[PDB]
């Protein structure tokens, strides 16, 4: 999971949301009468009503992420 | 999972949303009377009503992600 | 999970949200009559109503994250 | 989980939220009649109504985070 | 969990929130009739109504965090 | 959990919140009829109604934090 | 408009209404750029969402009503 | 408008209403740029959300009402 | 407008209302740029959310009402 | 407007109201830029949220009311 | 406006109201830039949140009321 | 306006109100830039939050009221 970025040197953005009665669920794990319930999160979870990302990563960025799960 | 980016050197964007009674579900794991319920997330989960990404990655960016699952 | 960023040298952004009766859930782990319930979070969880990220990572940034789970 | 950033040298941002009756839940672990309930958080959890991040990481930043879980 | 940052040398930001009857919950661990209930937090938990971060990390910053959990 | 920062050398920010009847909960551990209830916090927990961080980390900063939990 | 009633001597009732977003208008007189706008009411106007009349006029009742309008 | 009533001598009632967002208007007289706007009421106007009349007029009752309007 | 009543001699009632966001208007006279605006009320106006009348007029009652309007 | 009543001789009532955000207007006379605005009330105006009348007029009652308006 | 009553000889009542944010207006006369604004009241105006009248007029009662208005 | 009453001879009542943020207005006369503003009251005006009248007029009562207005 190696990540790299490099940069060498030598506009109206509008988002509009009009809502009412808005219900949002992200990662949901609903269960009844179980034995093992594991919720492993290691990435990027974004929840909301107006999830807006504007003009991100102007220069160099690295989001190197690694997750794992071992069961024996 | 090797990732790299390099950059060397030598407009109105409009999103409009009008809603009412909006229900959004992302990753859902619904169950009854189980034994093992595992939800492993290691990537990128975006939930919402207006999920807007504008003019992202202007320069160099790396989203190198790796996930795994071992069951024995 | 190695991450790196490098940068060498030698616009109105509008988000508007109008809501009422807004219910948002992020990571949810609902259960009844279980034995083991583990919620491991090691990434990035963003919850809200207006989750806005504008003009992030102007220079160099690294979000190298690693998660794990061992069960024996 | 090694992370690094380097930088060498030689605009109105508006977010507006109008709400009423807003209920937000982040990480939730609801259960009844269990034996072991563990909630391990080691990343970044942001909850609210207006979760806004503007012009972050102007220079060099590192958010290297590592989490673990051992069960035997 | 090694993190580093380096920097060498040789705009109105508006957030407005209008609310009423706002209930926010961050990390929640609700249970009944259990045996072991552990809530380990070692990252960064931000809760509120207006969670705003503006122009953070102008220079060099490191948020290297590590968490663990051993059960035998 | 090693962290470091280095820096070598040789704008109106407005947040406004108007609320009424606002209830905020941070880390919550509610239980009934248990045996062991442990709440270990070793990171950074911010609770409030207007949690605002403006222009933080102008120079060099390190928030290296480590947490642990051993159960035998 | 003569009215009379006479009376000489010698059971579950259920109404249930389940609604949401209900708009009711009774007598409406909407106009623009007029000269004379008269609304004469002399009878019986009942407005609502659940207008229920149960087991009315057990004995003797008289609702003798008279209205008039003269224009010269 | 003569009215009379006479009486000589010698059960569960349930109304249930469940609503939300209910707007009720009775007698309305809306106008713009007029000269004479008269609203004469002389009868019986009942407005509400649950306008319920149960077991009215057990004995003798008289609601003799008269209205008038003269314009010259 | 003569009214009379005479009487000579010789049960659970349930109303239940569950509401939220309820707006009720009775007699309304809205105008702009007029000359004469008269609102004459001489009958019976009942406004509310739960306008309930139960078991009224057990004996003898008279609601003889008269209204008038002269314009010359 | 003559009224009379005569009487000669020789049960759980439940009203329940559950509300929130309730706005009630009775007789309203709203105007702009007028010359004569007269509001004559001579009957019976009942305003509220729970306008309840239970078991009224057990014996003899008279509500003889008269109103008038002369304009020359 | 003659009224009379005569009477010759020879039960749980429950009202319950649960509210919050309740605004009630009775007789309202709102105007701007007028010449004559007269509000004549001579009947019976009842305003409130819980306007309850229980078991009124057990014997003999007379509410004979007369109003007038002369304009020349 | 003659009124008379005569009477010759030869039960739990519960009202409960639970409120918060309650605003009540009775007779209101609001104006701007007028010449003559007269408010004549000669009947019966009852304002409050819990306006309760229980078991009134056990014997003989007379509420004979007369009002007038002369304008020349």
What DSSP string runs through E1-69?
--B--EEEE---EEEEEE-SSEEEE-SEEE-SS-SEEEEEE-S-EE-SSS-EEES--SSEEE--EE---
Give CA torsion, residues E22, E27, E32, E34, to 10 deg: 180
**Type and span of the H or E element at J71:** strand J70-71
**How far does CA K66 lie from the centroid of its chain?**
14
Query: Which residues, 6+ apart, have CB-to-CB distance to B37 below 8 Å?
Result: A29, A31, A34, A36, A37, A38, B29, B31
Dig out the tokens for D9 from the structure: 């040298």
Query: Which residues, 6+ apart, have CB-to-CB distance to L2 below 8 Å?
Result: K1, K2, K3, K64, L64
Report which of A37, D69, A46, A61 is spatially closest to residue B43, judged by C-alpha positions: A46
Distance from CA of F1 to the nearest CA of D (A): 9
Dig out the tokens for K48 from the structure: 């409130």
CB C51 within 8 A of CB A48: yes
CA distance linking residue L24 with residue H14, whole number of Å:
30
CB contact under 8 A, G42 and I67: yes
Dig out the tokens for K18 from the structure: 């649960």
Give break positions in chain F: residue before each, C–N beyond 2.5 Å: 10
Exposed/middle/buried for residue L25 (C-beta within 10 Å: 0-12, 13-18, 19+): middle
Dig out the tokens for L10 from the structure: 């030869």
CB A37 within 8 A of CB D29: no
Query: Which residues, 6+ apart, have CB-to-CB distance to C26 below 8 Å?
Result: A26, A27, A45, A47, C45, C46, C47, D25, D26, D27, D28, D47
**How far does CA B55 lie from the centroid of its chain?**
16
Report which of F52, F58, F48 is spatially closest to residue F14, judged by C-alpha positions: F52
3-class DSSP string for G4-59? EEEEEECCCEEEEEECCCEEEECCEEECCCCCEEEEEECCEEECCCEEEEECCCCC
**How far does CA E52 lie from the centroid of its chain?**
12
Q: Which residue of J has its CA nearest to I26?
A: J26
CB contact under 8 A, H48 and J51: yes
CA distance linking residue K14 with residue G53, whole number of Å:
20
CA distance linking residue L53 with residue C26, whole number of Å:
52
Dig out the tokens for E57 from the structure: 């990390």
Q: Which residue of H has its CA nearest to I4?
A: H4
**Per-residue CA distances from I16 to G17, I38, J27 (Å):** 11, 37, 26
Inform me whether the C-beta atom of residue A59 falls under 8 Å from chain D C-beta atoms: yes
Name the experimental technique: cryo-EM
CA distance linking residue K62 with residue K57, whole number of Å:
9
Sequential DSSP letters for H37-72: EEEEE-SEEE-SSEEEEES--SSEEE--EE---EE-
CB L29 within 8 A of CB K39: yes
Dig out the tokens for G57 from the structure: 């006029």
CB F15 within 8 A of CB E51: no
**How far does CA H32 lie from the centroid of its chain?**
27
Report which of D62, D44, D57, A55 is spatially closest to residue E55, judged by C-alpha positions: D57
Between A13, A26, A61, which is nearest B13 by CB?
A13
CB contact under 8 A, F5 and E60: yes
CB I7 within 8 A of CB H10: no
* Number of neighbouring beta carbons within 10 Å of residue J36: 18
Report which of E46, D15, E60 is spatially closest to residue F53, judged by C-alpha positions: E46
CB J57 within 8 A of CB I57: yes
CA distance linking residue H41 with residue J65, whole number of Å:
14
Q: Where are the beta strands (DSSP E) in C1-72?
A: 6-9, 13-18, 22-25, 28-30, 36-41, 45-46, 52-54, 60-62, 65-66, 70-71
What does this entry list as its resolution, in Å?
3.2
Rg (CA), chain J: 19
Task: Give D51's contacts in chain A (Cβ within 8 Å).
Answer: 48
Question: Any known ligand binding at D25?
Answer: yes
Inform me whether the C-beta atom of residue K44 falls under 8 Å from chain I C-beta atoms: no
Q: What 3-state DSSP class applies to A8?
A: strand
> CA triplet H24, H29, H34: central angle to 5 degrees?
155
Report which of D52, L42, L29 is spatially closest to residue C48, judged by C-alpha positions: D52
Neighbours of chain D (3+ CB pairs under 8 A): A, C, E, F
CA distance linking residue I27 with residue H40, whole number of Å:
10
CA distance linking residue B31 with residue B33, whole number of Å:
7
**DSSP state, D18?**
E
**Per-residue CA distances from H7 to G8, H58, I4, I5, J60 (Å):** 6, 10, 12, 9, 13
CB F62 within 8 A of CB F3: yes
Inform me whether the C-beta atom of residue J48 falls under 8 Å from chain L C-beta atoms: yes
CA distance linking residue K19 with residue I19, whole number of Å:
10
- Do the two chains H and L touch, given a threshold of 8 Å on CB pairs and at least 3 pairs? no
CA distance linking residue K11 with residue J54, whole number of Å:
11
Q: For tokens 């469940």, what's the residue?
A: H18
CB D29 within 8 A of CB D39: yes
Dig out the tokens for E61 from the structure: 């910053």
* Number of neighbouring beta carbons within 10 Å of residue E12: 12
CA distance linking residue G45 with residue H46, whole number of Å:
6
Q: What 3-state DSSP class applies to J46?
A: strand
Dig out the tokens for D1 from the structure: 């989980």
Q: For tokens 């971060």, what's the residue?
A: E53
Beta pairing class for D65-66 and F6-9: unpaired
CB I39 within 8 A of CB J39: yes
Q: For tokens 């259920």, what's the residue?
A: G14
CA distance linking residue J69 with residue F70, whole number of Å:
89
Q: Which residue of L has its CA nearest to J34?
A: L34
Q: What order of strands is seen across the sheet that includes strand I36-41? A: G36-41, H36-41, I36-41, J36-41, K36-41, L36-41
Give break positions in chain B: residue before each, C–N beyond 2.5 Å: 10
Q: Report the Cα–Cα distance between both ends of chain J, in Å, rounded.
A: 24
Q: What order of strands is seen across the sheet that includes strand K44-46? A: G44-46, H44-46, I44-46, J44-46, K44-46, L44-46
CB E71 within 8 A of CB F17: no
Q: What 3-state DSSP class applies to A36?
A: strand
**Type and span of the H or E element at B8:** strand B6-9
CB contact under 8 A, I42 and K3: no
Report which of H2, H42, I59 is spatially closest to residue J61, judged by C-alpha positions: I59
5-34 in J: which are within 8 Å (CB) of K? 5-34
**DSSP state, D34?**
-
Task: Give L3's contacts in chain J (Cβ within 8 Å).
Answer: 62, 64
The phi, psi pair for B42, rounded to 5°, reads -145, 10
Sequential DSSP letters for F8-56: EE---EEEEEE-SSEEEE-SEEE-SS-SEEEEEE-S-EE-SSS-EEES-
Report which of A41, F63, A44 is spatially closest to residue B44, judged by C-alpha positions: A44
* Number of neighbouring beta carbons within 10 Å of residue C69: 26
**Per-residue CA distances from B25 to A23, A26, B43, B48 (Å):** 9, 6, 17, 8
**How far does CA G59 lie from the centroid of its chain?**
20
CA distance linking residue B67 with residue B61, whole number of Å:
19
Probe site for chain D from A36, A47, A72 (most D CB atoms < 10 A): A47
Report which of L23, C30, K33 is spatially closest to residue J48, judged by C-alpha positions: L23
CB J12 within 8 A of CB I54: no
CA distance linking residue E25 with residue F26, whole number of Å:
6
CB G30 within 8 A of CB I29: no
Exposed/middle/buried for residue H69 (C-beta within 10 Å: 0-12, 13-18, 19+): buried
Distance from CA of B51 to the nearest CA of C (A): 10
CA distance linking residue L27 with residue J39, whole number of Å:
11
Give CA torsion, residues J39, J43, J44, J45, to 10 deg: -20
Q: Where are the beta strands (DSSP E) in K1-72?
A: 3-9, 13-18, 22-25, 28-30, 36-41, 44-46, 50-54, 60-62, 65-66, 70-71
- Do the two chains L and E touch, given a threshold of 8 Å on CB pairs and at least 3 pairs? no
CA distance linking residue G14 with residue I14, whole number of Å:
10
CA distance linking residue C30 with residue F32, whole number of Å:
17
Q: For chain D, give percent helix, strand, coil, nearest 5.
A: 0, 50, 50
Dig out the tokens for I28 from the structure: 């309304």
Distance from CA of C3 to the nearest CA of D (A): 5
Q: What 3-state DSSP class applies to K17?
A: strand
Task: Give I67's contacts in chain G (Cβ within 8 Å).
Answer: 42
Q: For tokens 């959300």, what's the residue?
A: H49
CA distance linking residue H42 with residue J67, whole number of Å:
9
CA distance linking residue A62 with residue I58, whole number of Å:
83
CB contact under 8 A, D62 and F3: yes
Q: Which residue of F has its CA nearest to D69?
A: F69
Query: Which residues, 6+ apart, have CB-to-CB distance to L45 below 8 Å?
Result: K41, K45, K47, L26, L27
CB C15 within 8 A of CB D18: no
Query: Which residues, 6+ apart, have CB-to-CB distance to L69 below 8 Å?
Result: K38, K40, K68, K69, K70, L40
Report which of J12, I55, J57 is spatially closest to residue H55, judged by C-alpha positions: I55
**DSSP state, D2?**
-
CA distance linking residue J24 with residue H26, whole number of Å:
12
Q: What 3-state DSSP class applies to H23?
A: strand
CA distance linking residue G13 with residue F37, whole number of Å:
54
3-class DSSP string for chain I? CCEEEEEEECCCEEEEEECCCEEEECCEEECCCCCEEEEEECCEEECCCEEEEECCCCCEEECCEECCCEEC
CB contact under 8 A, E7 and C59: yes
CA distance linking residue A57 with residue B1, whole number of Å:
21
Q: Which residue of E has its CA nearest to D26?
A: E26
**Per-residue CA distances from J20 to D9, F35, G20, H22 (Å):** 61, 41, 15, 12
Q: Which residue of E has its CA nearest to F26?
A: E26
* Number of neighbouring beta carbons within 10 Å of residue K6: 21
Exposed/middle/buried for residue L12 (C-beta within 10 Å: 0-12, 13-18, 19+): exposed
Q: What 3-state DSSP class applies to A33?
A: coil
Exposed/middle/buried for residue G14 (C-beta within 10 Å: 0-12, 13-18, 19+): exposed
CA distance linking residue E47 with residue F24, whole number of Å:
8
Q: For tokens 């990540």, what's the residue?
A: A3
């Amino acid at each position: 999971v190696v990540a790299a970025a490099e940069k060498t040197k030598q506009g109206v953005l509008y988002v509009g949301s009009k809502t009412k009665e808005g219900v949002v669920h992200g990662v949901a794990t609903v269960a009844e009468k179980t034995k093992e319930q594991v919720t492993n999160v290691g990435g990027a979870v974004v929840t909301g009503v107006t999830a807006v990302a504007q003009k991100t990563v102007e220069g160099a960025g690295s989001i190197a992420a690694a997750t794992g799960f071992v069961k024996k």
